[PDB]
A paper describes a structure:
RTEL1 plays essential roles in telomere maintenance, DNA repair, meiotic recombination, and genome-wide replication. It is a modular protein consisting of an N-terminal helicase domain followed by two tandem harmonin homology domains 1&2 (HHD1 and HHD2), a PCNA-interacting protein-box (PIP-box) motif, and a C-terminal C4C4 type RING domain. RTEL1 is an anti-recombinase and executes non-crossovers by promoting the synthesis-dependent strand annealing (SDSA) pathway of homologous recombination through disassembling displacement-loop (D-loop) intermediates during the DNA repair and meiotic recombination processes.
To understand the structural basis of RPA 32C and RTEL1 HHD2 interaction, we determined the structure of HHD2 at a resolution of 1.6 Å using X-ray crystallography (details in the Materials and Methods section). The structure revealed that HHD2 consists of five helices, from H1 to H5, connected by a short loop. The electrostatic surface potential of HHD2 revealed a distinct pattern of positively and negatively charged opposite surfaces. RPA 32C binds mainly to the solvent-exposed surfaces of helix H1 and H2, while DNA binds in the pocket formed by helix H1, H2, and H4, suggesting HHD2 adapts to bind DNA and 32C on the same surface. The X-ray crystal structure of the HHD2 domain of RTEL1 reported here is the first structure of any domains of RTEL1.
Residue numbers in the entry: 14 to 95
Write the structure that this text describes.
Amino acid sequence: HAVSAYLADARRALGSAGCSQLLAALTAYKQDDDLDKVLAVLAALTTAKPEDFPLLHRFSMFVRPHHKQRFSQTCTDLTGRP
């Protein structure tokens, strides 16, 4: 139940509107395969406080195999290694 644990943590840290924006961006990503767009929503929401940085890295669970390397590189440039 990694997904429900992520959604519980994200709704707690980001609030309902922020969690809803993250899930809408995930929906859009599954439709359009645009990694940069989903990453930009996620980074706006999860890098405002250092304590939310793990929610940036943990989003990798939803990132498609062909984008996981680039996603991990960008998250490390934003926040360091997890």
